[PDB]
Write a protein that binds this ligand. Structure first.
Ligand SMILES: [Mg+2]
Lengths: 186, 319, 228, 228, 228
DNA sequence: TTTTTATGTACTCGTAGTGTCTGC
DNA sequence: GCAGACACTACGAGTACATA
């Protein structure tokens, strides 16, 4: 901190002029700021009957179909492009929707279910040890409470929680609250 | 008035404008560029189309030319992180010894795999902002990370006003005329020049590239006008037979286009959309969409095309 | 203005406190860490006969290894650096002053709050020692009369109490027990024998090692407690 | 219990053959694949002091390069494990045996139909030719009295016809004819001198690789052909 | 037929020009790059006794380090390449000529527009510097009655505006004036002293290096300029 | 004002780890 | 002769597109 007169060189200027790239990097990483899309001005036009004309902007037959999939007033039209639309021009799939789904409004919230993260890990586990697909696995868990005492079996299987396997269950440090959680109360 | 490069035969690159005035642009846009060249210093800028050949990468070099910058021109896809650390850091830190604005032109920077380089650039732009500025050229903005658009004046092309379009077109016609004098191309009918411009409007590159291919015979006459306004493949015989609701004719055209179906079906959607009433549109997609969908299960493809025609004939209410 | 095995050597080192450097005219040269933490001055045989700033020193010097020792360096026509060799010539870029951090002035060291010294292998011993066992910080302080250094690993020894190497320097005539700390990557000086002046006036202090070639000054670390 | 520098290396190696392992008390380890293709046994000089099952091996040997080498790996106070360190302590999961495929069959290689040796430097040459000459199967057999190896290319040369490689391994004296084919994929030993004992009666069979640091036994591919 | 270290060091070179090669009986070998930019011809120690096309040169040369330095080679009954060792033996796929872009014969070099020569000592310094100086292309013109050479940075440079380097070759006897630019990338020659043969018939134009071992031709750059 | 299906296939980037070879 | 430093490879991250 010598010299004692430096108009502070900004976090960047120091990164670069000194040329250690690892500090330059974290300065890079600074703005990663990941978000994008504007697909809701496309949904909006199909709804409000304004004009966009597409072509210019990226379009998602999956994203437009799903968004509308919300309001039952639309399902007839989406249902249509769903059976039939596989194989239509994005230009088309769009032009159609303009001329079918009639009113306009929608407010935001999609419906996503509530996952008990624990319950999913448990079924994903059972289907692993037992080489069954997910529906029997759910049967097993229903059964395995009501006798044969789920702690007996979760204790045997706590063996494979391999943290490759957790990445399959949730996506965050919620995922590390779980490593511990069945390592525990059985 | 017109800059010619003379090291190129390819002719849409022979006539590439040297300065900001030679460029044909929307009024407000030209004016904002004059404003910039006036102040003598050039900010960080993004030029984007997404329609090709509106003049983005041309105006990039012109802006530099007008302010007399020391300019490094760089292919976007060549500008990976080690380039920015390497060659660009050198140039951006070095001092031009005539006191010229230093400017780095990164052309066609909208590639996806360069996001890592672009982030690395966001810190750079603030460090070296005193020396030199960056002009990015892009076809699709979303390929430019948000913090780079924050740091720039984003100027957006080829989306003129209704008036600009009318002026720009006059300006482009005047220009084409002038290119013809120079090139030895005889203009018999001015109507064909106004037609080439209108045909390919946003894209001024293709509009000149066209002129080369219709000049085979050194003259533009009423006969060339037929080929410029005319449609070389088309759909017309089907569209017409559909309106007339006749069948023997539809029955006969089937085998013609069964040849390549996926393309034909596409044109038919595109072309009927314009020619039929609003709730006929919604019906036509259900009819064409369903037909397209089962094609490739359907065993006789020529018949499957006939089936499509009979279907549309009856249900299409034509505006 | 040719350059000798002697003067290039010391310069490859300044290249490690700071990548670029600014040299003025004299037999005088000096650099600093962009961030402050470090510094270094020196006088040398050969004579700098023009003002110029460099961006890529480590690079610049590599380029010199490739021409004739008797290669005369000049300020080139435009104002960059012409390196005229035997039957060839190289032109390396003069860089923009405002993109190279050099010392404002040759910071003048106060009087010693403390004085002692160090030995070449001792400095060799230490430098060598740390990284191996993972040490990355140290501390000079009075211990049983004399002065000694205690090397820590501040990554796995946060609050600094499990020494992992130690070296004695020479006893302490004055009277009070102080405690000085330095980061380890901050120790750029070249081995050999250095007289070690120490200093303090606030939560701020310094430490100017004196070698028989050049001088190095290193800041302290925030949690050092002098006894003044 | 404590695990050495040589033991752990037969542990990264037994991971290339099974995700999981079960070693038990003794000075013996062994594992074989969930597809019963590949068997590997090894006698170590660190004496394993209890019966444990790990769902994952190559995961465990990871939390073990970090800890220093005291590593009193004991058993946790709740059925899991305890890696004791010079200065820390770590806890790995421990799987119910129902979740690991363990050999359970220290069956003894019957008797050798024929025996022969291979020099380690000459495993070298083959483990490497095959890489860039593109081999994926080989066949051990008799050419001109000695026992040879042929490398082929099951994909390009669909029926082992054009030999991309041959290697000569010291004569056969017994009077038999044979052609033992092995899918290179299912071959996983670290180099070294290896005794080669190959057995087969009629159609069932296998090859056993005796080495001074481990033992290896794999299965002839579909078509191998002999008269024993 | 056998091949020695010296021979191969060549072909490992000729690889960097064309990854394939066709070669026939004699002490002559040659390759020209697929794209029509460079070409090398070679007289060599070892002796070729049959025609053969190699698809993957850069790795055949590789296979060859995988046996002793002496193994004999020939055309197999198998009309492929047999590298036979003391103990082992390899069988390298000889490719169909159709696919190995080779030169039918040897085209003479236009009695040279201009002549001069370059010390191998000198040329090492060019390559050496070019890494150091990011010199990607060069130009050979006439500065004051002598033949110079200038390295550039076509990247940062664009117009070849500023010279970063300038060897000084011979003197210029005759009275034309020119500027022959050369893509550094296109310069694939094992170092050693060369005679230099330049040529141009207007828009036509090339450059020939005349070694002690082989001769090399590279294409000028698009606006190499001259009055020939 | 809202926000991403599951399987298989292909391609580019950066970086880290890996190996063979040469100047002071 | 060995480090240094170069050239190469393997991998994981993010993007993409056709199917269902
Ligand atoms: Mg462009």
């Amino acid at each position: 901190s010598l010299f004692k007169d430096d108009i502070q060189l900004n976090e960047h200027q120091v990164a670069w002029y000194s040329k250690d790239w690892t500090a330059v990097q974290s300065a890079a990483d600074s703005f990663k700021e990941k978000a994008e899309n504007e697909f809701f001005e496309i949904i909006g036009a199909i709804n409000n009957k304004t004009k966009c004309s597409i072509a210019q902007k990226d379009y998602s037959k999956f994203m437009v179909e799903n968004a509308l999939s919300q309001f039952p007033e639309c399902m007839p039209a989406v249902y249509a492009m769903n059976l039939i639309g596989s194989g239509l021009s994005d230009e088309a799939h769009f032009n159609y929707l303009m001329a079918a789904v009639p009113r306009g409004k929608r407010y935001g919230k999609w419906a996503k279910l509530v996952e008990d993260s624990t319950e999913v890990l448990i079924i994903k586990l059972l289907a692993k040890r037992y080489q069954v697909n997910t529906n029997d696995a759910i049967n097993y868990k229903s059964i395995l409470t009501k006798n044969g005492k789920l702690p007996l079996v979760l204790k045997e299987l706590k063996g494979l929680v391999t943290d490759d396997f957790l990445k399959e269950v949730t996506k965050n440090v919620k995922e590390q609250k779980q490593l511990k959680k069945l390592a525990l109360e059985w | 008035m017109i800059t010619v490069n003379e090291k190129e035969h390819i002719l849409e690159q022979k006539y590439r404008p040297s300065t900001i005035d030679e460029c044909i642009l929307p009024a407000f846009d030209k004016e904002t560029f004059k404003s910039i060249t006036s102040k003598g210093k050039i900010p960080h800028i993004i030029l984007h189309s997404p329609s090709p050949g509106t003049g983005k990468t041309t105006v990039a070099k012109a802006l530099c030319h007008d302010v007399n910058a020391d300019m490094m021109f760089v292919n976007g896809s060549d500008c990976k992180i080690d380039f920015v650390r390497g060659p660009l850091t050198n140039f951006a830190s070095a001092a031009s010894f005539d006191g010229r604005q230093k400017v780095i032109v990164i052309d066609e920077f909208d590639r996806s795999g360069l996001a890592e380089s672009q982030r690395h650039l966001r810190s750079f732009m603030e460090a070296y902002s005193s020396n030199c500025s960056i002009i990015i050229t892009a076809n699709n903005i979303d390929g430019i990370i948000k913090p780079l658009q924050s740091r720039c004046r984003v100027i957006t092309f080829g989306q003129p006003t209704d008036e600009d379009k009318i002026e720009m077109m006059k300006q482009m016609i005047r220009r084409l005329t002038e290119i013809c004098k120079h090139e030895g191309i005889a203009i018999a009918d001015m109507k064909v020049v106004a037609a080439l411009v209108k045909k390919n409007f946003p894209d001024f590159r293709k509009t000149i590239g066209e002129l080369d291919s219709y000049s085979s015979k050194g003259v533009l006459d009423a006969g060339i006008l037929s080929l410029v306004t005319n449609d070389r493949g088309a759909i017309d015989d089907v569209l017409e037979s559909l309106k007339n609701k006749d069948v023997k004719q539809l029955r006969a055209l089937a085998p013609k286009y069964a040849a390549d179906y996926s393309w034909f079906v596409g044109k038919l959607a595109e072309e009927i959309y314009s020619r039929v009433t609003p709730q006929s549109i919604i019906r036509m997609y259900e009819i064409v969409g369903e037909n397209n969908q089962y094609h490739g299960i359907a065993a006789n493809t020529e018949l499957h095309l006939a089936y499509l025609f009979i279907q549309l004939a009856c249900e299409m209410q034509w505006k | 203005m040719k350059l000798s095995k002697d003067t290039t050597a010391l310069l490859k080192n300044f290249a490690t406190i700071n990548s670029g450097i600014m040299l003025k005219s004299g037999q005088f040269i000096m650099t600093r860490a962009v961030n402050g933490t470090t510094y270094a001055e020196a006088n040398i045989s050969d004579v700098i006969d023009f003002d110029v700033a460099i961006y890529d020193l480590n690079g610049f010097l590599g380029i010199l290894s490739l021409v004739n020792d008797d290669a005369e360096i000049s300020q080139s026509e435009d104002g960059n650096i012409k390196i005229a060799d035997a039957r060839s010539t190289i032109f390396w870029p003069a860089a923009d002053p405002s993109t190279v951090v050099a010392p404002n002035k040759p910071i003048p060291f106060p009087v010693a709050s403390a004085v002692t010294e160090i030995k070449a292998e001792d400095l060799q011993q230490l430098l060598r020692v740390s990284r191996g066992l993972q040490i990355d910080t140290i501390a000079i302080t009075v211990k049983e009369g004399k002065i000694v250094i205690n090397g820590f690993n501040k990554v796995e020894d946060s609050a600094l109490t499990r020494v992992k190497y130690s070296l004695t320097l020479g006893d302490y005539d004055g009277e009070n027990t102080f405690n000085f700390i330095i980061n380890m990557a901050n120790m750029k000086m070249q081995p050999g024998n250095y007289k070690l002046l120490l200093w303090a006036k606030g939560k701020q202090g310094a430490a100017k090692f004196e070698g028989e070639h050049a001088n190095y000054v290193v800041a302290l670390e925030a949690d050092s407690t002098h006894d003044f």
